[PDB]
Design a binder for this molecule. Sequence first.
Ligand SMILES: *[C@@H]1O[C@H](CO)[C@@H](O[C@@H]2O[C@H](CO)[C@@H](O[C@@H]3O[C@H](CO[C@H]4O[C@H](CO)[C@@H](O)[C@H](O)[C@@H]4O)[C@@H](O)[C@H](O[C@@H]4O[C@H](CO)[C@@H](O)[C@H](O[C@@H]5O[C@H](CO)[C@@H](O)[C@H](O)[C@@H]5O)[C@@H]4O)[C@@H]3O)[C@H](O)[C@H]2NC(C)=O)[C@H](O)[C@H]1NC(C)=O
Ligand SMILES: *[C@@H]1O[C@H](CO)[C@@H](O[C@@H]2O[C@H](CO)[C@@H](O[C@@H]3O[C@H](CO)[C@@H](O)[C@H](O[C@H]4O[C@H](CO)[C@@H](O)[C@H](O)[C@@H]4O[C@@H]4O[C@H](CO)[C@@H](O)[C@H](O)[C@@H]4O)[C@@H]3O)[C@H](O)[C@H]2NC(C)=O)[C@H](O)[C@H]1NC(C)=O
Lengths: 669, 668
Amino acid sequence: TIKTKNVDAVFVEKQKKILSFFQDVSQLNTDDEYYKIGKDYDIEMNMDNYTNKKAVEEFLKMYRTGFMPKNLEFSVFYDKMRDEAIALFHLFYYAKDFETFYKTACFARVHLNQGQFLYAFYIAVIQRSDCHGFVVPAPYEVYPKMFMNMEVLQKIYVTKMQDGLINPEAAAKYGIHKENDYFVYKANYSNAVLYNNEEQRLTYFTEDIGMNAYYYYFHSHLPFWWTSEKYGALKERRGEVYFYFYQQLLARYYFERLTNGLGKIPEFSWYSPIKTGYYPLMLTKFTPFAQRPDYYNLHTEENYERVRFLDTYEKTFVQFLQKDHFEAFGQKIDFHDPKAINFVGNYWQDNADLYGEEVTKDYQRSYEVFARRVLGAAPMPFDKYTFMPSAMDFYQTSLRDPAFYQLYNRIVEYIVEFKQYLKPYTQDKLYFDGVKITDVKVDKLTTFFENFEFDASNSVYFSKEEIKNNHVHDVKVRQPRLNHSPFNVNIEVDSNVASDAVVKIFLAPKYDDNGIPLTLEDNWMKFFELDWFTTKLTAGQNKIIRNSNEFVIFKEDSVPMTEIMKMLDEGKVPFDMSEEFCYMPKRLMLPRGTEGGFPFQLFVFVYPFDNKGKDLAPFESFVLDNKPLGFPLDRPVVDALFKVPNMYFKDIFIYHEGERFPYKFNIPS
Amino acid sequence: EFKTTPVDAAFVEKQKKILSLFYNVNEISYEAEYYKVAQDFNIEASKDCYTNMKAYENFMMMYKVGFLPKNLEFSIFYEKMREEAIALFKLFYYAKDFECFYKTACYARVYMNQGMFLYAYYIAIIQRSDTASFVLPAPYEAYPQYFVNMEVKNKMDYVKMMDGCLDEKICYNYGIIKENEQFVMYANYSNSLTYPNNEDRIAYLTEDVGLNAYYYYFHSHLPFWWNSGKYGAFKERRGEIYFFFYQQLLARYYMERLTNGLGKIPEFSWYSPLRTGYLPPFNSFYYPFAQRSNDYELHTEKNYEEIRFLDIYEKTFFQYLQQGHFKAFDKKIDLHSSKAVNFVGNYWQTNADLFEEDFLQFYQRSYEVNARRVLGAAPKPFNQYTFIPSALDFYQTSARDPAFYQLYKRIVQYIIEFKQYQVPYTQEALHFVGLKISDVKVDKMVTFFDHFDFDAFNTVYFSKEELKSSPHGYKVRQPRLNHKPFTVTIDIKSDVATNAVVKMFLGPKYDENGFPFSLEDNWMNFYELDWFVQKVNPGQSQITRSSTDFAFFKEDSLPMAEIYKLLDQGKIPTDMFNSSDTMPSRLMLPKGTYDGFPFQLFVFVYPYEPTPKESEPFKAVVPDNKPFGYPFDRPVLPQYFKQPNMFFKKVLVYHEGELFPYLFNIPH
Ligand SMILES: *[C@@H]1O[C@H](CO)[C@@H](O[C@@H]2O[C@H](CO)[C@@H](O[C@@H]3O[C@H](CO[C@H]4O[C@H](CO)[C@@H](O)[C@H](O)[C@@H]4O)[C@@H](O)[C@H](O[C@@H]4O[C@H](CO)[C@@H](O)[C@H](O[C@@H]5O[C@H](CO)[C@@H](O)[C@H](O)[C@@H]5O)[C@@H]4O)[C@@H]3O)[C@H](O)[C@H]2NC(C)=O)[C@H](O)[C@H]1NC(C)=O
Ligand SMILES: *[C@@H]1O[C@H](CO)[C@@H](O[C@@H]2O[C@H](CO)[C@@H](O[C@@H]3O[C@H](CO)[C@@H](O)[C@H](O[C@H]4O[C@H](CO)[C@@H](O)[C@H](O)[C@@H]4O[C@@H]4O[C@H](CO)[C@@H](O)[C@H](O)[C@@H]4O)[C@@H]3O)[C@H](O)[C@H]2NC(C)=O)[C@H](O)[C@H]1NC(C)=O
């Protein structure tokens, strides 16, 4: 049951070519075609194959000075590395056509750093208009080192060195099985071996390979360092997207807190220690990730300069708030204008659009970059190419760190402060003339854990022979992930006059920790959007049914790249990998329930789909509306002036079936 | 409904005399019996009302000077007041017969500070062997100001000032109603303005009137300041009781924490900020109770000396342990004997036994007292009779403050470090040769909240006319935790007919993580539920045992109104007489979940060894030479706990009705 889609042999060929770059990523098959091309490809000679003369010359000047060497860890948060990554991005992006693009990537694969290559390649494929419709495999299949602890990795390594198992039945005791010609390794979350604070309750969520892969997709669809000029309409809305993404992510995460009895995301100070440490169990082929003990004093000698920066960055904003109206960055900004959200978001991401430029520049110091460094607790980089990575140097790992959520909670809250300048909507804007919701009904909402496997083959090094015969796909990791049963939502509406309408579905908490009901006044930002759609109303009474698996904001699991090869032989590609790349995985839609049924609420909004004066189709097939994202919960609400006949709040309860605890799935018997 | 005991008429006269000093404690009725008797009681010319000339003349020395004046706060923790309280206790306790005791109490009831009187009087009733079996009203009826939140107290005061209700419907909306010409005031547990942190999840256990009263009774049954000579053979096991009492309580408390998602009791340092604050909604005549903010620095100027005292008090203990062969206050004591456990508890309590004297002496400084003063956060006393109260100043209010459980958990951790020197029980010491528990089954264990009344009449003031009629009728009503009765069914096979002891314990199954506990790490987290002697038959037999019969829990106290009504039938509530010092039944179970909260029940069966007849100070002291808490009184080697005559059952605790107590105090 995988949503498919049919394709021609020209596609399959290009698609196989694109996919070839993701196989055995840390090595060279000097037999493969990609090698022959790559070895000899003369870039200077091919200058006429690029849309941009100077991007080629800028690159070639960079390349003659030398790029980041092989094997070292790449991260986009460091100046010289970013600039090489962008330089290579441009080269990919300005390739005349596919042929040129492909030969260019072959060169880059053979000669450049692999994390650098992959980072740029990945973005290029999402960005090149002639690649829209193509499929890239899951980031966890591409960087499996980033999506798994030391324990699994070492087992995998041990098995490769021995070239199999010395003892099938001793292997079984270690969660290592042979099925077919595959090695399957069971893997626990890190709390099964480490419980250093309460945040360890949530590792099935923060360590979820889907969630982390999600954040890397989000970054790749629009890098902070690149303008959004290519997405037209989205440009005047970039800041709003930035807010909305984090606001959503944090509501979802907060929900996981409530069901695990953990309450609000803690605030911190640049001048005080921060409470909760992180102790990464991840390995870099060159180094260990940095640890932040509990009660880490943010303000020590090595941070004095970085913290002076963060503080002014924040204070300048407090000053914008106090000023209401002001000229910043060559733009007059007014805080009572809701459109100022563009500037607000851009300011916090320090993205290229803040300056109205193509690419950010070194001297445009980023707040997020320096927060990540400060909170990362790493010692100072050794040189331009050599740093001590923390979870927060990578999009693939950021969600693993409790401090990640505290950082962006911080930024979101400051944005909420600005939101207080927006007038709350009146009756008039929210009221659907002659339309009323009479009931909403939901199927039982249940969560449960079920096993999930992925190809971890890139973490392993193969011999010259194995690379030839192409036995290079034999390592799978088995890990319990959260999931939920499909459920329906019945909306019963009355309308006297037939007309087109938008239906919106939101999920929210019902109580704080004291068990007092959520007022809207305080809690409008803790609402999580489940679904957007339209229907045709008729005079009288209608029943609208919508399945959880028709929900537009979520996708199915990626399929392993091995299965994509099987399918491409039939002329098929899985739909959700192609145009639903960067949505959250469906299985993580709901927070883990409790066995007695945890109290939430479901909010259902129905409003007229008038025309489509302005609709998002550029980056996201998202707001086909002139409506702010998260409409109507995009600004502070007044309980009294808010509720109208076309809104319905229904009390809902989230259950859980089978084992409550992931580790219970990895016990050998 | 409640267990009663038939009671004779001579008893009814006396019990009535006792109860009568508890009416309108805050005022004097010029025409009550007690006042006339006090007017007529010449303290000077009655040396011959007392067993002990020294006690008498000691009292007179102090009396001719003057005592703590009326209306000020009394606390046993300040020296001059304690010494006054103890002088009064001595008089009460060395009174030749009941009539002399009655006359003295009347005298004190009129001429002395009421907190001081009530304190010595409770204690006296419990200790005098001619009053042994007499009943006391619950402390919450005797001191309602320590058990009523301020909000409710002000509501009560304003109805008294208005002399009733403006109109029912206004008052109903403030949670004030009339039943049978009596006022009922609905009371919530406090919100985050008094618990400014997660500890507020637990307000329904920590502010519970039963649990606070429980602790007061415990103190009154053997006060730190008195020797235990009264109880003979028990003297050699006092320090044992101290550990056991606090280990049990912390085990109970951690279990409530667990069901509310809250984790380990936090550790602290005298040199560091204490995380969890508390703002008491109480006040004395002069002062609101001291508040302790979140992140309160313990180490400030005013605490420097106290902290140096506390710090070395602990490290002295460590030095004993380091030395093995310790020796304070007369003897050399060996760590592997039990003269040791006695010493340990006494040491942490600085009780009169530690120094082997009758009463604690003026200059003997207490660890607990100094800790309580540091954690209580109050500014220093104005003079010796006037201090600024905090929750830690009273046994009636101590259990409300999260720091209370942290201080006692620290002391318990230290004692446990000593238990590392005790020899663990072997296989042979735990095996009941010839006997096997083959199964255990339990009924649904279900918690719920339901309403609870008591008379708070003792903190409303009344006119001269109203006092002639001893007026009550100001009731506070609170949702309170509770459980449905259940039965435990034990299946036994033995080879031979023998007398056995059956014990039950409740402990956690999983830590906050969701991992199973090991016995080695969990033995201190079990609290005892029941103890009883069973006659086993040879072969296959079956023991059923209802929760309403558990040895270590009591029914709810009755209000005095009911006590007099029962007295008029020659009836008395068994549980108020035979076991006041025992935890209330309704709190036997931590709050469950709709779900069913995972815990575990330990049933242990061992031989009964005939131990003769005593008359000890608590119901925890059971007719058995075994350690209290046995076989969980010391560190465990888990391989020895798979004895045929032991059994661990997973039980789940459910909850029914509303999960939140405030849902019961909502008007319409
Ligand atoms: C505003 O604030 C001020 C200052 O804080 C406060 O003033 C204080 O008032 C209290 C009383 O309300 C004063 O205390 C009284 O003082 C007299 C005399 O004190 C001096 O003489 C003593 C002996 O001569 C000496 O020993 C003292 O040290 C002092 O120098 C006392 O005689 C008062 O009576 C006693 O009070 C006690 C009863 O609670 C008893 O211990 C004592 O014995 C009893 O007395 C009767 C006779 O009446 C006897 O027959 C019995 O045997 C019985 O046992 C006696 O009654 C009392 O201590 C205090 O001194 C004032 N402070 C200052 C600095 O002057 C105001 O009251 C406050 N005003 C308001 C409106 O709040
Ligand atoms: C993920 O995380 C969970 C939680 O951390 C892990 O779950 C744990 O899995 C353990 C197995 O790896 C399990 O331990 C076993 O418990 C069973 C049940 O009591 C025992 O039978 C096992 O004992 C055998 O191995 C011991 C040492 O390895 C020996 O000392 C012992 O002798 C025994 O061997 C057998 O017993 C006979 C002795 O008479 C011997 O003759 C015979 O030949 C046998 O071989 C293990 O102790 C943990 O209990 C379990 N934890 C929990 C809480 O359930 C999970 O493994 C992790 N998964 C992955 C994939 O990493």
